[PDB]
Design a binder for these strands. Structure first.
Ligand SMILES: [Cl-]
Ligand SMILES: [Cl-]
Ligand SMILES: [Zn+2]
Ligand SMILES: [Zn+2]
Lengths: 123, 125
DNA sequence: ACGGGCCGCGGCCCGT
DNA sequence: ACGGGCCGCGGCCCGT
């Protein structure tokens, strides 16, 4: 589990602190512990820079839709996209790919946080 | 809404066991849980206000995984917190024995815990 | 195996 | 909708 967190940490971008990244990754890995296929799809997607199409990586949607990490609240798909792909990401600059089944905009009970299931768009 | 008068009257019957702020936080927490349980809330007001003059109904809250309740950053058993508040300000661990009348006593290991202080009696054991 | 810590996050309510 | 601080249950680790 620690080797998984460490391997995902190696692919973070300089958007936030090392400590924020660690807490965000630990939180996500713990939720995917009982979902082997989703965890494997996350490791493969991050490690290979989304080289091949990956499966949805989902977490339970909160009542307000935001996730809190180290005292900061934000949309979960935005947090993980900022962390591994766009460190300067803000507002509504994300558009989900047609392949993504559990995209944040699709208003499902489960939210896809796979950063390679979203693409950056102009404001 | 209309909770403020209920919290205030229960506050009037607290004992000098803890701070005024701790007592309000504990009472507000309990009143909010009993908002949808009219009979249990009325039994709590009647029991506290009359110093347990007549037999009252069980006043229950949902049991937590660990069995303890947190109030203003401090953890403790819920039946102990409310018994210390309204009856025994100097109350310690293993000093409470539930009355035969009490259906949801902490020791009975139910999904619901009775926090009515007049449903427990102080012992030496 | 308790208690007694604090410690992060969801649910919560209140401010530009 | 935001961006906080808010408190508490659910976690965890520490001294007995
Ligand atoms: Cl989207
Ligand atoms: Cl008991
Ligand atoms: Zn997806
Ligand atoms: Zn009872």
């Amino acid at each position: 589990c620690l080797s998984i967190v460490h391997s995902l940490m190696c692919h973070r971008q300089g958007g936030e602190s090392e400590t924020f990244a660690k807490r965000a990754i630990e939180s996500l890995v713990k939720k995917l512990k009982e979902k082997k296929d989703e965890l494997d799809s996350l490791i493969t997607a991050i490690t290979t820079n989304g080289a091949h199409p990956s499966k949805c990586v989902t977490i339970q949607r909160t009542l307000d839709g935001r996730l809190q990490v180290a005292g900061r609240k934000g949309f979960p798909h935005v947090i993980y996209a900022r962390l591994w792909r766009w460190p300067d990401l803000h507002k509504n600059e994300l558009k989900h790919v047609k392949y993504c089944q559990y995209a944040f905009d699709l208003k499902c009970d489960s939210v896809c946080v796979n950063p390679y299931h979203y693409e950056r768009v102009v404001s």
